[PDB]
């Protein structure tokens, strides 16, 4: 028997080990294969009540390669190093967010 | 202008139109019909159509002061079921004019009112229903639907996770809330009331609501994720249901639960309209469904009740886990899950979709897999239902050896590993045990859960295939 | 204080108490159970009891922070059904503490919630229910009951007479009211809405209510007898049902009708409380009953729904005519008619009364014989149901050759002759045709009715005996 | 006391008083009248006055049981329009006694009720209206007005900035709120609903309200400026409009929007009174105005509808941008903007002010410039409307290459540079491009905006000059 | 998934579908349209459809986070009026998804909202409206009607 | 494409470059030419919800020269150096504030 510790979570893919940039690359590849538009959002906090983070640039509508999204993610990391950064995938057929995982915690 | 002929006559003369093609505004019903020996099948189907729309046993002179052909239900097709001496699928078309707009109750009262007890009939099952777009437009539908719900709870990219607090009945309100807190802080998105928990001497509903709300606030503060608990507002009366819903709103609860069959469709539609009017999500429990939908030869198939619940209103609905302790076939469940979640579902007899159903942008309903499942079923469920679903582990979370919170964490880790492997491009139906095994190598709570329930598996004959 | 054993275990260990005697405050349920081959019957019954009261598939540690034995449902008896390889009657006893006071919905959700879809079960039927006096006291029961209804409508010494206006759907509100007037002025105590007539494009409910009220006033003024019309207030929502009921009250209507199954028990109890609060009689239509109660091996027998409707509230309830177009056996119908009307009904397996039921002065419910009957069935019905019943001739009145009013008069004359001959000391079951024949010799409307329907008779195999 | 002469007679005998001088309490109407060939102009104007106040086609004897001269509308002047063979401006004076106090609906029904379809008339336009001070006093006017609005939103010294979220219809509630947040955090004071966005299957109004309120709170927290979003409460019924307004109040929203023409003046006055009673600002969208006010020869000029909207109630009103994608002449727009914002506006035929209008301290209405404008139009708009106006860039903000927030910032920088240069003593109409160019040299968002829309310009023939 | 092109473009590219046949659930509008001299009639009708359903003057990037083709109003026919140099009847089809159920106000605000004041338009008349049965069902209609009255 | 930074704003004339005292002088000159009464307000915070700042002395009703308003502004700066200081212009014909710009941030 072991007591579950008290950790703050960050929605989907937060109860998994620290996300290697390879697994992040696979997640962005997956949302590209499904036709989801990737976007990079950032915020100073990760409160669950917060509906909106701040959009970094514009969603990668013309994107076709995971390296481009990774470049936006690292650009956000360089500009905001004390911000939670997450990668979202917009499905536009049903107009609903279809992927959302955090890629960066405040440094 | 015909004369009046007093006396009984065959139903088939005026109610069996095999040449009639269905109008696009008609309601279409598929009936699995088993007549008595020596009863003509077409006469049996004509009796079904007549007694479901306008027919009486004998001729009435008031039929003449009307245009009967514009209201009569017509059986436009009868085809024998394979491998059946006396079982036929009859397709009956009803004019849109027969049904009260926005009333699921009236639709069911017209369709399944008294034809199931016809003496000339041995068994009757309502398999499927084509709801025309014009009729669909008269309903509110789900108060929110899948996408609005996901936006409101800020949860994307995975199935949601829930649990029913066990034991069903017996726990005090405070201990109930403590169990809710321990489950929620472990990683479950939702907890829920057992469908029997309404307001009992051991647990008054107001105390349960208060303690559950406190546990939700505590676990939300801890984990930093939106936590919820389906509060059963099912009550004896509509006033009591509304009071419970209003108190759930007062406690800033995001979701309430209702039993749409034991509670009824009138109260369900009332609660769905209230939920839309007050921004409350509506989880729908299908208690007593198996009384109606268990047998192949008689009753109403759950896809009909699912369409009716979608129109009457519900954000979640239980659909059966396929692989759990309760009965539901894979193909039919896939069929009515697509019926509940999709906007357009094409005709497919192989999945029980007897009619092409178009929802005209009526929002879809979340699928709820609940009953006798643990982490080992997690890959298959992620394979079956996908993201737009809720996976409910009552005994699979509280039954974990370490407690509610470690069991919740074990389920969350199994779910997240399955989602990750699915996204990466793995075959979940093939390597589900592989994914679970690596996650157990990483997760001790998951390891204990899997070693506890490794040889637990519900398989029996499928009575409804 | 036992330890916590995580893992699944047999239900029979903690849920099959064959030595337990039922407490007088327990709810007793008789289940016709057909398990899967190779599933022990006692394990199947224990699963039924556990999943209907507190049991989960695996052990939960929250069971220990409770007194389980005071809430667990127990199967205290299993006896094989005669002539059945795998069908047994299981008697399950539930503590009074499990159920919400005054809630039929909660009772059914606990009992018939999800056990009917257990994978280890092939078929399940809820045959009978023992409602303890202590539980009965928490319900309102019928808003008025038989004797208060008879006092209010000033009708004594005979069964009441009614009719459904035909066709079911299609008639305009004004023509509907005209048919109501013609039926009522001929001698019928009541007319009624078809269970499908709620509010349709061809007939808005408010216009129907207005015209029906006018016809009632005209026929009451003419005949000098209390006339009534069951106004269907069944609606999509509880607010709409309440608006229709309030308008029926405003028009000084004495009785309203509701479908307690398609409408639901929540709305039914709401309407019954409203009816008690506003002096309105409540006719109860059992639409969709045959979906649940038609098969012998699966579902809920109508006597259970009848007890639940008596507690939830209803002055009238449909019971089946035995000899009409809809299925119901003689013995079982006698059983649940006694259950609905009497205060004390002793145990009788031969009539389907598995438990002795005491109603503790809960008023009885009027029995309604409706569906495929004419004057020829009149003696038998007077023999079967007696005075405290309503005999409904939809097609047997409007289908008369001369019109609604002569058909109503023919039925009234047949009924009054049968009552007179019964009072005088004649054998109605023997000389029913004799009484009808002499009345026809005196009544021309009756003569035409009898010559029209002489060879009309519904007989088939009894699926529910 | 004259006798009664049954029969038709000319309108000019009793309705054309060319010597009559208008009382100061009279309502004065200027009509651009084009009669049929061979119809005397004075007879045509007399018909207009008679059918707009009291006249019927023939003489009625009930005219004698009255003092007709105290209610009759009189045409006290007719002057030919320059360059018109058959077009005349007729000035008609109506007694104050004819109109219901505080009712714009009644005023319009009296004035523009049925005279526009007179057979003897070819075309009729209501150009201007003199509302007497005594009539003005019976209205609430704007719920707040310009100065109270500026005090409430704590915004002084510049025009306000807004944007309509694009696309008009199609966006989900959550994405809509995200666009609102991005626009608001960039520097826009306001965002707004498209006039078509009320409550649609893709976007329920309650979800939109919730998400918009959250975006407003986030952007207010970020920028530290009062942020707002015009929430369209236009609905099918007044109850639904009131529910939407009440929810907007519950979410602590400062402003709501209404379509006063498609919604109607009854609902508009209801909402304006509600807005005054609950401290809510009222943005007024003029959807369907161009159906009435586009042609020079027929309809109602927008200045009449603007006076009526000022009296019925509105804090903002759309006035046309002059230089955008929608039609409105410079001089007439200046005229009705002064009519909407000023307390005293003197007679000026050159600007379409046919009457001197005194508002008796009725607060002014903010002018809204919306439709097909970008940063290049910014100086001219600041020149045209001044500070007490709202400049709305729907496509000029979301259509910026970098996104909503950079486009909002580009518009804010252009506006602030224009205001600064105006305050310093620069000629905005002359050096507007100069100011924009220096700001672009300083602002990259502005540079991208200007290089995107440099050659975008809507110029056509002015149909309404 | 297309990229984002900031800048104005012709309405006719995405709002004039002359091959499109009307769905039975669409709202159909007949417009008597008189454009300015030198304005293409089809461009004028496309502007009517765009500004009546979803179109803005320039391209917005939020169009991409949507399925535009399921909401856009389409002009599926333009036929010249007899004896008219510059007057055409344009038939525009609107998806049922655009309109609030049971709201005549919303229907008119969508249809006749601001297209009648388009600068490229000289005159516009809404001649007729096809209300689909599915939309008709969402309204109460007359409180009673002729026969009940 | 460039992501907009998160900056706190201070209403009118805040989205322009740092205000030179010459441009401030021109703004006060403008409000003197229009007949607006200038006043100097100060506050510890610049929350948008705050309707009222604290008035410094009294509005310069008798003012006719921009130097006098500049003298009040610098006096407020000297007395309150950790306060937001803004210059308001009261139009008394319509009785509404007509000019409002910040002249000092907490230093
Ligand atoms: O109690 C449970 C599951 O709890 P557990 O995890 O202990 O099995 C649910 O109420 C029903 O069983 C779901 O099944 P259905 O789809 O029939 O409602
Ligand atoms: O329509 C009728 C009878 O009309 P008719 O006289 O034409 O047969 C009743 O609604 C049900 O049939 C009664 O049966 P049940 O007991 O099943 O409700
Ligand atoms: O949609 C808009 C402007 O958006 P955009 O910035 O894309 O042009 C407005 O609703 C009307 O067009 C304003 O004009 P009017 O004064 O006729 O209401
Ligand atoms: Mg349960
Ligand atoms: Mg009936
Ligand atoms: Mg608009």
Residue numbers in the entry:
A (entry chain I), F (entry chain L): 1 to 107
B (entry chain B), C (entry chain A), D (entry chain H): 11 to 475
E (entry chain G): 11 to 159
From the paper:
Far-red light photoacclimation, or FaRLiP, is a facultative response exhibited by some cyanobacteria that allows them to absorb and utilize lower energy light (700–800 nm) than the wavelengths typically used for oxygenic photosynthesis (400–700 nm). The fraction containing the FaRLiP-AP core complexes also contained ribulose 1,5-bisphosphate carboxylase oxygenase (Rubisco), and the structure of this enzyme was solved to a global resolution of 2.35 Å.
The sample was initially imaged and screened using a 200 kV Glacios cryo-transmission electron microscope and subsequently was used for high-resolution data collection on a 300 kV Titan Krios transmission electron microscope. Processing of the latter dataset revealed two types of particles: asymmetric classes that derived from the cylindrical FaRLiP-AP core complex and classes with strong bilateral symmetry, which derived from form I Rubisco. The derived structure is very similar to numerous other cyanobacterial Rubisco structures.
